[PDB]
Amino acid sequence: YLTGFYSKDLIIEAVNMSYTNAWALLMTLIATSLTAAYSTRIIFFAFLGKPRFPPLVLINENNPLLINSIKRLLIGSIFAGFIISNNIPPMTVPNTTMPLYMKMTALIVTIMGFMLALELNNTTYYLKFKYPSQTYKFSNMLGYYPSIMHRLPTYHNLSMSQKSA
Amino acid sequence: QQERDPWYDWDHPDLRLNWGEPIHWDLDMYIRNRVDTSPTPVSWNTMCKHLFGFVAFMLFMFWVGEIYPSYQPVGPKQYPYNDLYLERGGDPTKEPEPVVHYEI
Amino acid sequence: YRHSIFAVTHVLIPVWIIHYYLKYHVTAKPYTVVERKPRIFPGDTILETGEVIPLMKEFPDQH
Amino acid sequence: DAPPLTLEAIKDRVLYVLKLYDKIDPEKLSVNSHFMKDLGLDSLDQVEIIMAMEDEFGFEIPDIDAEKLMCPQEIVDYIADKKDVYE
Amino acid sequence: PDSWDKDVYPEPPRRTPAPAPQTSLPNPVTYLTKIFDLLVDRPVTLAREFIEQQHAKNRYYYYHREFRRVPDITECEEKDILCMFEAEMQWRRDYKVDQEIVNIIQERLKACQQREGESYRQNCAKELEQFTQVSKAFQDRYSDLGAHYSARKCLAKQKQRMLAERKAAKEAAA
Amino acid sequence: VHIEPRYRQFPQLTRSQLIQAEFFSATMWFWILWRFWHDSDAVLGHFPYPDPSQWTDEELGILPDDE
Amino acid sequence: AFSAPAAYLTHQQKVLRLYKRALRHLESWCVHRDKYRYFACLMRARFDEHKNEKDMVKATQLLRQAEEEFWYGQHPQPYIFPESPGGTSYERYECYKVPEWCLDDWHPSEKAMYPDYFAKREQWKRLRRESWEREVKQLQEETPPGGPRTEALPPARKEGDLPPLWWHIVTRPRERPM
Amino acid sequence: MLKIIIPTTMLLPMTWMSKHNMIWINATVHSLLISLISLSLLNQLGENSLNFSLTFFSDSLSAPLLVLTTWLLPLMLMASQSHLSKETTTRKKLYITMLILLQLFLIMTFTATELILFYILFEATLVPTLIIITRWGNQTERLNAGLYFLFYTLAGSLPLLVALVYIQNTTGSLNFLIIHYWSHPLSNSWSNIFMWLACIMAFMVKMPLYGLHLWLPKAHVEAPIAGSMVLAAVLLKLGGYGMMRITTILNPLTNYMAYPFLMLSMWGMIMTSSICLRQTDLKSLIAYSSVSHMALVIVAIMIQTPWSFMGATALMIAHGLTSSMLFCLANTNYERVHSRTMILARGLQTLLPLMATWWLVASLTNLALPPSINLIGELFIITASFSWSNITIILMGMNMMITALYSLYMLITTQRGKYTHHINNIKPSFTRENALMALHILPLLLLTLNPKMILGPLY
Amino acid sequence: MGAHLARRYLGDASKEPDPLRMPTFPPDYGFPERKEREMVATQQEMNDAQLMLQQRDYCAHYLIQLLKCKRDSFPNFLACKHEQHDWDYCEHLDYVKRMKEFERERRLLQRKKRREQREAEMARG
Amino acid sequence: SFPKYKPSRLATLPATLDPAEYDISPETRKAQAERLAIRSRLKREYLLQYNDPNRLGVIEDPALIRWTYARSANIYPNFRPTPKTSLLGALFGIGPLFFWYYVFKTDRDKKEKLIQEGKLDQTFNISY
Ligand SMILES: CCCCCCCCCCCCCCCCCC(=O)OC[C@H](COP(=O)([O-])OCC(O)COP(=O)([O-])OC[C@@H](COC(=O)CCCCCCCCCCCCCCCCC)OC(=O)CCCCCCCCCCCCCCCCC)OC(=O)CCCCCCCCCCCCCCCCC
Ligand SMILES: *P(=O)(O)OCC(C)(C)[C@H](O)C(=O)NCCC(=O)NCCSC(=O)CCCCCCCCCCCCC
């Protein structure tokens, strides 16, 4: 019932209930799960556990400007979705009738991402070390897209710019 | 220059060049703002294979999902006045082929 | 006092200028400002002519 | 933003780290004690000391400069010179 | 408003529904509109009253220039430079007038689309047909003359079109 | 307010920020529970999904195979 | 950065640099402090195991194999200090560094806005001008006839002299200039 | 037109009779006054041109070019007084005389009503330019640059003279009004092909066309600052004006003869932008950017539609202003460090803030940034080329991407980064240089405000 | 999503319906007397209400009523629950009508398959 | 053992993985010493000029001058007509022109054929 519920849930319901591309639908569901996963990663590695910052503790978030700005953007993150959804006129026909499992699909995949990411992050405390996987290397290095596509085409264009023209 | 040592006291710290030393013919393209040649944790051939395989598999699966779409067990949606003939810009003078929807 | 001086200038003067510009200059040539026609629903009263738009027929009500 | 550093603060923090090192006896540790000549450590111990100081102060000392910091006073002077601390 | 011609720039009669509230809650839109009228509309109205009073004391007029028709390039003899000049100038003026006519029709089309809003595809069919006809005629007149267009070139194009039409009619009658 | 820096110690917190954080967390949870209590059809649905297997051939207009 | 490099790295220097790099990458892999302590102790155990080796060829072979292992097992995204060359806060304050030669092009009114600072600046300029000849003489006296064999510089051998080539090192912009 | 022509011929004796220290002041003041007077030519008619007399006429195409020339003269005076401080009084007066003669010839060229008088004047413009380049250039290569410029222009233009006298013999007149009214179609023959070739090739060499453009980097890099300003802003626009004037009698042969020139223009636009990407000299980068923009103008004139001509005119005016400003900025940098290398001077944003602002605005105008008249002209040309064919959009998009790339590359290289440590003679920017930049940039923005003044007769 | 996709793709697409071609049988095939659907809202009423062309279905009257209720009770944006429920229920009934059409098409197709198989068996025998 | 790393032109070989880094001849050490001596000589010259208090201007860099000269003015005098240069110039300078000419010619011929046959959608095409 938060601000993201009034848009993401309807989007997922529309994707599941339409004449869509099957691969696109599957990738959308997996992306929702991975959204839950990386939100868990941020929370787990930034807020939970023991300090890992330098000993000189300069932490101070008591500034009224920061507090009030985050407050104002925090009231919107709770209530603005309800107000906006209930005040705009109906511009699309709702998906009133659908199976219960399809109705709960967004929540189920979100919770599965939460749980799997939480377990994987919890395994980090073990005194166990292993070299990374090829899938991990692909994901961490951004699919190798910036490397190849920022070194090869740029090199060829800059080389033809001088050698040929 | 990205491969060049950052902890050395170069005469030109940003370009990582010294005064008087020979300048590479392609310095204009090998500056830190441009093409980089520094070693990567993964081999270049492996990176090319992984990226190409990923994009090709995604395109193939998008085509597969296009030829095998996902839908719902419902009939076509029905609209009252000859599938809204006049409201979609139909010619008032010409007579449309009637579209009749029944109860079920 | 600072907020009052800010409000009169920064808000009051521009709204005066823009309202004067729109009413007497922009809305002096045709089609410069076009408003989408208001929605008319059954069982309504058009105020231009005192007209009464009638209600819809009896619904086949369920439950 | 952050409070400025001082020579006394830098010296106190480096001596704090060194006294929390187990291989160094806190009682015989002075600011002029040499890491290998009179403290009996070796190259790997000195590397770990430099890494501990890097973690303490939040900045990296390059290997070319770190090999020559064989004394707490040398480390203090290096850090003060790099951070532009004169008092 | 009498500033422009209602026939040249038609507006459908405006039907505004009367308010039919169903709640005891006050209307913030109504309150803010009252505030706006009190704070902005009255001062701008007084300022415009003063300005118009100043304008009424110094009333003066400007006129619309009238051009009489002159013989066209069809009537002009070959290499009769003066007649060719007059005909070319008249053709250019007519070209400008036709461009402005097309502009008027396009303004009609845009205004009707915006006005009808969500029912534009059906309610703007009359303005789409007028635009189609006007644009068809304008294109047939001045479609592909070029950067160095002239009345002679437009006449040659019209002659070519007339020859094509005559040939088509003869072939149909054959 | 001036917060003195700490060395190797937990930072100095403020009652105001503590109570504000607690209030906003409680507000979020109250909003979630209050919305779920009133309109739970946004989560669990509002209308049942029919089973097509139970629709009779007579009402679906299906004639006997022999006929 | 402050030290003049040598012609080459010794075997001890290479192994120490590998030790530091391996420890840092292990810390990047082992996020938590206790896990990092455990695995760093194991890494130092490996280094101690290979510490005493009389065969230099075998020692170099061990170093090479360890380098290959490090390259295979390196963290693709190792931790970098913000001010370090790979860091996020690297070179952010370079646009804020302005030199004193630019400082002396000010208008007389601007200089009058700071009367006490420019008096000390003139004292520094006089100190610079009164020592350049002694510095160049010292540099040319102590250099070998072949030329400078290294980038090192000598200190001041005299009671009243200054270390040669000192001006820009001493008057370099502050690390947080503005 | 005499009310503008005579004041220049009076600028001459005023320059030669003024005192030694007052030449710059008098020349600048009276050049600005003449520019203000020439601002009255912008009041044009919608039907025909302004036919003052049998010899001179003005049009919606000639008026912005004349105003640009008259406005460009005082800026050239400012730059010249910047770089000619130690010259003798006689040589200062000779340089001012060369500039005045060039402006007079350009005015008479843009207002000439006959093609042969236009030819005479637009060829007379070569002598002052050649003298300026080969006399007040700084480096050795000025002589070779002048030779290349002169011989390219003359080898292009002599067949144009032969074609013009032949056309006069055949038709009876070279008067532009007569040849426009009495124009007849050009049949597909070898003789007509070669007449078309003579005229178009003369003006293409003047443009320049890709493959006929080496003289442009040669002359622009090696000319003094005033010469560089006049070469890019106005002297490159003589080719476009001539092509927009002669193509009246070259139809319908322009439909079939324009293919090689269109292909050369598009591909060489791409190639010169790519060359700009890898230039170690700032002046050369500016010159090649000029080549690319004039190639786009050539594409517009060759496709020859009412939407293309308006874009051509707007792009010519915008390019003149922008290229003049870029040359002035690069010349200030050169006067600082006495070298044209781009990577020599860095950190110039932290060393000179307002000049960094001027560089930013000039670079943003160099690339098509809306709603600037640069973008107006480029977008009109791109739309006309799209109507011509639907792969020209691919070529134009590639060119726009490379244009943004090299413009921002120049900006980041010259202004951003850290300053060179050993360059310690970069004095604060002068009021004269700042005023030069402001006078370059403000009229461009005002033209953006009022765009129908530079869209040509086809508007 | 659903078992129908599995049946059609990993099975007999001939017996499963075609969504892009449905219906392939006459509306009276199997229905002796079938009633045409009733439309409450008129074309002029929908045009005045400016319903989106997607929203001008057989449930348009409930949408018009909901819009009128929302406009009148504007500050109280929580006072149109009954109208919203009426519109949603009408849409639900339309959706179950579509589902009934799909099921009817499916079983008509499989009945046709059984009939053709029986005819083929009779011809063979 | 561990998978090998294959260097490329855009992903070079690291120093720690270079085989020659672990096979150091006594002549390699003297070569490194000579290189360091050259660097030290250049650095000393630059630092003397840079710390000179009476210097006002730019320390001219002959290396930069040589780079800019070899990039621009030294190319044609050292250019020779060879089969490689001739073929590369012909291709890179002529082939694109003919390619684009063919593309645009084919497109425009098809468009004009459609115009003559009268089956090209040109309604509302008023601006050209
Ligand atoms: C050409 C292929 C094209 C493919 C296109 C399609 C791609 C689809 C991708 C799908 C998502 C993949 C997610 C994992 C990849 C990234 C792993 C990684 O690096 O993590 C490190 C990273 C931690 O970073 P770190 O702190 O640096 O830790 C360092 C590592 O520990 C260092 O340790 P490490 O390096 O060993 O860690 C990696 C290791 C450990 O990670 C895992 O095991 C992750 C497992 C995730 C869950 C998978 C199973 C889900 C089962 C769901 C069952 C219920 C379904 C629903 C129905 C229920 C009712 C019936 O993972 C693996 O070994 C493989 C994981 C799976 C890979 C999938 C892609 C295959 C590529 C080709 C085959 C390669 C095979 C060989 C591998 C390479 C060579 C050795 O992990 C996380 O942060 C969490 C990851 C996310 C967990 C939740 C994921 C939920 C969504 C996916 C599952 C589906 C849910 C339902 C969706 C809706 C359905 C309708
Ligand atoms: P101090 O001056 O006492 O130093 C003593 C030294 C080491 C200099 C010795 O005197 C010495 O030279 N001994 C002989 C040479 C020698 O020790 N060679 C061996 C060096 S490498 C070694 O054997 C240890 C390597 C094992 C660990 C490799 C790390 C790779 C894993 C990293 C993966 C990255 C993420 C974990």
mmCIF file of all heavy atoms in Angstrom, chain B residues 8-33:
data_model
loop_
_atom_site.group_PDB
_atom_site.id
_atom_site.type_symbol
_atom_site.label_atom_id
_atom_site.label_comp_id
_atom_site.label_asym_id
_atom_site.label_seq_id
_atom_site.Cartn_x
_atom_site.Cartn_y
_atom_site.Cartn_z
ATOM 1 N N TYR B 8 53.644 8.284 -10.061
ATOM 2 C CA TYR B 8 54.869 8.966 -10.444
ATOM 3 C C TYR B 8 54.626 10.465 -10.553
ATOM 4 O O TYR B 8 53.526 10.917 -10.883
ATOM 5 C CB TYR B 8 55.395 8.417 -11.770
ATOM 6 C CG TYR B 8 56.698 9.036 -12.220
ATOM 7 C CD1 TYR B 8 57.912 8.570 -11.741
ATOM 8 C CD2 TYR B 8 56.713 10.084 -13.128
ATOM 9 C CE1 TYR B 8 59.101 9.133 -12.149
ATOM 10 C CE2 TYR B 8 57.898 10.652 -13.540
ATOM 11 C CZ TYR B 8 59.088 10.173 -13.049
ATOM 12 O OH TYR B 8 60.272 10.737 -13.460
ATOM 13 N N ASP B 9 55.671 11.241 -10.262
ATOM 14 C CA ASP B 9 55.594 12.701 -10.317
ATOM 15 C C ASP B 9 55.891 13.154 -11.744
ATOM 16 O O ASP B 9 56.978 13.633 -12.071
ATOM 17 C CB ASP B 9 56.554 13.326 -9.314
ATOM 18 C CG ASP B 9 56.460 14.837 -9.282
ATOM 19 O OD1 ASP B 9 55.516 15.364 -8.657
ATOM 20 O OD2 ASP B 9 57.330 15.500 -9.883
ATOM 21 N N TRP B 10 54.891 12.993 -12.607
ATOM 22 C CA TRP B 10 55.010 13.430 -13.989
ATOM 23 C C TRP B 10 55.047 14.951 -14.070
ATOM 24 O O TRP B 10 54.502 15.654 -13.215
ATOM 25 C CB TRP B 10 53.843 12.906 -14.824
ATOM 26 C CG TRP B 10 53.660 11.428 -14.775
ATOM 27 C CD1 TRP B 10 52.875 10.729 -13.910
ATOM 28 C CD2 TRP B 10 54.264 10.461 -15.640
ATOM 29 N NE1 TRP B 10 52.956 9.386 -14.176
ATOM 30 C CE2 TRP B 10 53.802 9.195 -15.236
ATOM 31 C CE3 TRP B 10 55.152 10.544 -16.716
ATOM 32 C CZ2 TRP B 10 54.198 8.021 -15.868
ATOM 33 C CZ3 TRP B 10 55.543 9.380 -17.341
ATOM 34 C CH2 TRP B 10 55.067 8.135 -16.916
ATOM 35 N N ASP B 11 55.706 15.458 -15.113
ATOM 36 C CA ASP B 11 55.701 16.897 -15.356
ATOM 37 C C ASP B 11 54.301 17.391 -15.692
ATOM 38 O O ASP B 11 53.918 18.502 -15.308
ATOM 39 C CB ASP B 11 56.676 17.247 -16.478
ATOM 40 C CG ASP B 11 58.116 17.011 -16.089
ATOM 41 O OD1 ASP B 11 58.432 17.132 -14.889
ATOM 42 O OD2 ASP B 11 58.933 16.707 -16.981
ATOM 43 N N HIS B 12 53.525 16.581 -16.412
ATOM 44 C CA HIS B 12 52.126 16.872 -16.724
ATOM 45 C C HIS B 12 51.291 15.801 -16.036
ATOM 46 O O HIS B 12 51.071 14.717 -16.597
ATOM 47 C CB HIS B 12 51.886 16.889 -18.232
ATOM 48 C CG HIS B 12 52.903 17.679 -18.997
ATOM 49 N ND1 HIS B 12 52.996 19.052 -18.914
ATOM 50 C CD2 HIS B 12 53.873 17.289 -19.857
ATOM 51 C CE1 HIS B 12 53.978 19.472 -19.690
ATOM 52 N NE2 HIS B 12 54.525 18.423 -20.275
ATOM 53 N N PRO B 13 50.825 16.054 -14.810
ATOM 54 C CA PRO B 13 50.148 14.988 -14.049
ATOM 55 C C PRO B 13 48.893 14.448 -14.712
ATOM 56 O O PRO B 13 48.629 13.243 -14.626
ATOM 57 C CB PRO B 13 49.828 15.671 -12.711
ATOM 58 C CG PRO B 13 50.771 16.823 -12.627
ATOM 59 C CD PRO B 13 50.957 17.295 -14.030
ATOM 60 N N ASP B 14 48.106 15.302 -15.369
ATOM 61 C CA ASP B 14 46.844 14.843 -15.941
ATOM 62 C C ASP B 14 47.071 14.009 -17.196
ATOM 63 O O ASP B 14 46.429 12.969 -17.379
ATOM 64 C CB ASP B 14 45.937 16.036 -16.238
ATOM 65 C CG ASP B 14 46.628 17.106 -17.056
ATOM 66 O OD1 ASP B 14 47.871 17.201 -16.987
ATOM 67 O OD2 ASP B 14 45.926 17.855 -17.767
ATOM 68 N N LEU B 15 47.976 14.445 -18.071
ATOM 69 C CA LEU B 15 48.333 13.656 -19.241
ATOM 70 C C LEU B 15 49.317 12.542 -18.919
ATOM 71 O O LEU B 15 49.499 11.645 -19.749
ATOM 72 C CB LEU B 15 48.929 14.553 -20.328
ATOM 73 C CG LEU B 15 48.035 15.640 -20.920
ATOM 74 C CD1 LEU B 15 48.764 16.362 -22.037
ATOM 75 C CD2 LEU B 15 46.736 15.044 -21.425
ATOM 76 N N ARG B 16 49.944 12.582 -17.743
ATOM 77 C CA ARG B 16 50.981 11.631 -17.347
ATOM 78 C C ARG B 16 52.104 11.593 -18.385
ATOM 79 O O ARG B 16 52.416 10.561 -18.979
ATOM 80 C CB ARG B 16 50.385 10.243 -17.097
ATOM 81 C CG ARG B 16 49.427 10.219 -15.918
ATOM 82 C CD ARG B 16 48.814 8.853 -15.709
ATOM 83 N NE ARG B 16 47.813 8.870 -14.650
ATOM 84 C CZ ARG B 16 46.997 7.862 -14.375
ATOM 85 N NH1 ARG B 16 47.033 6.735 -15.067
ATOM 86 N NH2 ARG B 16 46.120 7.989 -13.384
ATOM 87 N N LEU B 17 52.701 12.764 -18.597
ATOM 88 C CA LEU B 17 53.812 12.941 -19.517
ATOM 89 C C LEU B 17 54.927 13.713 -18.829
ATOM 90 O O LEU B 17 54.680 14.528 -17.937
ATOM 91 C CB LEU B 17 53.388 13.692 -20.784
ATOM 92 C CG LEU B 17 52.578 12.949 -21.843
ATOM 93 C CD1 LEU B 17 52.180 13.906 -22.950
ATOM 94 C CD2 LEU B 17 53.372 11.783 -22.404
ATOM 95 N N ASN B 18 56.155 13.449 -19.256
ATOM 96 C CA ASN B 18 57.325 14.187 -18.809
ATOM 97 C C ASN B 18 57.800 15.117 -19.915
ATOM 98 O O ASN B 18 57.511 14.915 -21.097
ATOM 99 C CB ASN B 18 58.456 13.238 -18.401
ATOM 100 C CG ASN B 18 58.332 12.767 -16.971
ATOM 101 O OD1 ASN B 18 57.341 13.041 -16.299
ATOM 102 N ND2 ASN B 18 59.343 12.051 -16.496
ATOM 103 N N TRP B 19 58.537 16.147 -19.516
ATOM 104 C CA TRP B 19 59.069 17.110 -20.469
ATOM 105 C C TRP B 19 60.276 16.509 -21.177
ATOM 106 O O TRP B 19 61.229 16.070 -20.527
ATOM 107 C CB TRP B 19 59.450 18.406 -19.757
ATOM 108 C CG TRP B 19 60.019 19.452 -20.662
ATOM 109 C CD1 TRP B 19 59.337 20.450 -21.288
ATOM 110 C CD2 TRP B 19 61.392 19.609 -21.038
ATOM 111 N NE1 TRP B 19 60.196 21.217 -22.034
ATOM 112 C CE2 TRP B 19 61.465 20.720 -21.898
ATOM 113 C CE3 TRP B 19 62.566 18.915 -20.733
ATOM 114 C CZ2 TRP B 19 62.663 21.154 -22.455
ATOM 115 C CZ3 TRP B 19 63.751 19.346 -21.287
ATOM 116 C CH2 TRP B 19 63.792 20.454 -22.138
ATOM 117 N N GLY B 20 60.232 16.484 -22.507
ATOM 118 C CA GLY B 20 61.339 16.041 -23.319
ATOM 119 C C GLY B 20 61.249 14.606 -23.792
ATOM 120 O O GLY B 20 61.891 14.258 -24.789
ATOM 121 N N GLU B 21 60.471 13.768 -23.113
ATOM 122 C CA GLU B 21 60.364 12.378 -23.517
ATOM 123 C C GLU B 21 59.573 12.267 -24.820
ATOM 124 O O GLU B 21 58.726 13.115 -25.114
ATOM 125 C CB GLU B 21 59.696 11.551 -22.422
ATOM 126 C CG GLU B 21 58.224 11.850 -22.211
ATOM 127 C CD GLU B 21 57.596 10.945 -21.171
ATOM 128 O OE1 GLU B 21 58.348 10.245 -20.461
ATOM 129 O OE2 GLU B 21 56.353 10.929 -21.066
ATOM 130 N N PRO B 22 59.844 11.242 -25.627
ATOM 131 C CA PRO B 22 59.128 11.101 -26.900
ATOM 132 C C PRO B 22 57.632 10.927 -26.689
ATOM 133 O O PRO B 22 57.188 10.288 -25.734
ATOM 134 C CB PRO B 22 59.760 9.854 -27.528
ATOM 135 C CG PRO B 22 60.390 9.128 -26.396
ATOM 136 C CD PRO B 22 60.844 10.179 -25.440
ATOM 137 N N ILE B 23 56.857 11.508 -27.597
ATOM 138 C CA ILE B 23 55.402 11.467 -27.543
ATOM 139 C C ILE B 23 54.909 10.454 -28.563
ATOM 140 O O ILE B 23 55.313 10.492 -29.731
ATOM 141 C CB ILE B 23 54.798 12.856 -27.808
ATOM 142 C CG1 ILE B 23 55.073 13.787 -26.629
ATOM 143 C CG2 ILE B 23 53.313 12.746 -28.069
ATOM 144 C CD1 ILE B 23 54.452 15.148 -26.775
ATOM 145 N N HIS B 24 54.050 9.539 -28.119
ATOM 146 C CA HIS B 24 53.500 8.531 -29.012
ATOM 147 C C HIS B 24 52.747 9.195 -30.157
ATOM 148 O O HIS B 24 52.075 10.213 -29.973
ATOM 149 C CB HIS B 24 52.573 7.591 -28.238
ATOM 150 C CG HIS B 24 52.135 6.389 -29.014
ATOM 151 N ND1 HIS B 24 52.725 6.007 -30.199
ATOM 152 C CD2 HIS B 24 51.165 5.477 -28.768
ATOM 153 C CE1 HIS B 24 52.134 4.917 -30.652
ATOM 154 N NE2 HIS B 24 51.184 4.574 -29.802
ATOM 155 N N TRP B 25 52.888 8.619 -31.352
ATOM 156 C CA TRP B 25 52.224 9.155 -32.537
ATOM 157 C C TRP B 25 50.724 9.303 -32.316
ATOM 158 O O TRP B 25 50.106 10.254 -32.807
ATOM 159 C CB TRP B 25 52.512 8.243 -33.731
ATOM 160 C CG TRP B 25 51.819 8.619 -35.001
ATOM 161 C CD1 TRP B 25 50.547 8.301 -35.365
ATOM 162 C CD2 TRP B 25 52.376 9.357 -36.094
ATOM 163 N NE1 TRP B 25 50.269 8.809 -36.609
ATOM 164 C CE2 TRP B 25 51.377 9.461 -37.079
ATOM 165 C CE3 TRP B 25 53.620 9.946 -36.331
ATOM 166 C CZ2 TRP B 25 51.582 10.131 -38.281
ATOM 167 C CZ3 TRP B 25 53.822 10.608 -37.521
ATOM 168 C CH2 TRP B 25 52.809 10.696 -38.482
ATOM 169 N N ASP B 26 50.124 8.377 -31.572
ATOM 170 C CA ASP B 26 48.689 8.379 -31.300
ATOM 171 C C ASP B 26 48.374 8.837 -29.883
ATOM 172 O O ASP B 26 47.467 8.299 -29.245
ATOM 173 C CB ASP B 26 48.104 6.995 -31.551
ATOM 174 C CG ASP B 26 48.101 6.622 -33.014
ATOM 175 O OD1 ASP B 26 47.844 7.507 -33.853
ATOM 176 O OD2 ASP B 26 48.352 5.441 -33.327
ATOM 177 N N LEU B 27 49.112 9.817 -29.358
ATOM 178 C CA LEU B 27 48.779 10.358 -28.045
ATOM 179 C C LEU B 27 47.395 10.990 -28.039
ATOM 180 O O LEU B 27 46.673 10.896 -27.040
ATOM 181 C CB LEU B 27 49.825 11.384 -27.611
ATOM 182 C CG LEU B 27 49.473 12.175 -26.347
ATOM 183 C CD1 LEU B 27 49.608 11.305 -25.108
ATOM 184 C CD2 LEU B 27 50.309 13.436 -26.220
ATOM 185 N N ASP B 28 47.003 11.618 -29.150
ATOM 186 C CA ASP B 28 45.730 12.327 -29.206
ATOM 187 C C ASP B 28 44.548 11.395 -28.972
ATOM 188 O O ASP B 28 43.476 11.848 -28.559
ATOM 189 C CB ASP B 28 45.596 13.036 -30.554
ATOM 190 C CG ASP B 28 44.630 14.199 -30.509
ATOM 191 O OD1 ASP B 28 44.110 14.501 -29.416
ATOM 192 O OD2 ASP B 28 44.391 14.816 -31.567
ATOM 193 N N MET B 29 44.717 10.096 -29.226
ATOM 194 C CA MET B 29 43.661 9.120 -29.002
ATOM 195 C C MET B 29 43.913 8.218 -27.804
ATOM 196 O O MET B 29 43.001 7.492 -27.398
ATOM 197 C CB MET B 29 43.463 8.245 -30.248
ATOM 198 C CG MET B 29 44.586 7.258 -30.495
ATOM 199 S SD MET B 29 44.324 6.254 -31.966
ATOM 200 C CE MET B 29 42.812 5.411 -31.533
ATOM 201 N N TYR B 30 45.116 8.236 -27.235
ATOM 202 C CA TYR B 30 45.457 7.402 -26.092
ATOM 203 C C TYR B 30 45.429 8.164 -24.776
ATOM 204 O O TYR B 30 45.892 7.639 -23.760
ATOM 205 C CB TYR B 30 46.832 6.765 -26.296
ATOM 206 C CG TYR B 30 46.828 5.625 -27.283
ATOM 207 C CD1 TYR B 30 47.911 5.396 -28.114
ATOM 208 C CD2 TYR B 30 45.735 4.780 -27.388
ATOM 209 C CE1 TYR B 30 47.907 4.358 -29.018
ATOM 210 C CE2 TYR B 30 45.725 3.739 -28.287
ATOM 211 C CZ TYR B 30 46.813 3.534 -29.101
ATOM 212 O OH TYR B 30 46.808 2.498 -30.002
ATOM 213 N N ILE B 31 44.909 9.390 -24.770
ATOM 214 C CA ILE B 31 44.781 10.156 -23.537
ATOM 215 C C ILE B 31 43.753 9.475 -22.647
ATOM 216 O O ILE B 31 42.969 8.641 -23.111
ATOM 217 C CB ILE B 31 44.393 11.618 -23.815
ATOM 218 C CG1 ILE B 31 43.177 11.682 -24.739
ATOM 219 C CG2 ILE B 31 45.568 12.380 -24.396
ATOM 220 C CD1 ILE B 31 42.689 13.083 -25.006
ATOM 221 N N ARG B 32 43.749 9.829 -21.361
ATOM 222 C CA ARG B 32 42.841 9.192 -20.415
ATOM 223 C C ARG B 32 41.380 9.479 -20.728
ATOM 224 O O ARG B 32 40.503 8.745 -20.261
ATOM 225 C CB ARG B 32 43.178 9.642 -18.996
ATOM 226 C CG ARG B 32 44.535 9.167 -18.507
ATOM 227 C CD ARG B 32 44.945 9.915 -17.259
ATOM 228 N NE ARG B 32 43.914 9.850 -16.233
ATOM 229 C CZ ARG B 32 43.875 10.630 -15.163
ATOM 230 N NH1 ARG B 32 44.795 11.555 -14.949
ATOM 231 N NH2 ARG B 32 42.883 10.483 -14.290
ATOM 232 N N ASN B 33 41.097 10.523 -21.505
ATOM 233 C CA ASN B 33 39.734 10.817 -21.924
ATOM 234 C C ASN B 33 39.267 9.942 -23.077
ATOM 235 O O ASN B 33 38.074 9.949 -23.396
ATOM 236 C CB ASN B 33 39.613 12.286 -22.331
ATOM 237 C CG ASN B 33 40.120 13.226 -21.266
ATOM 238 O OD1 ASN B 33 41.313 13.518 -21.198
ATOM 239 N ND2 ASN B 33 39.216 13.714 -20.429
#
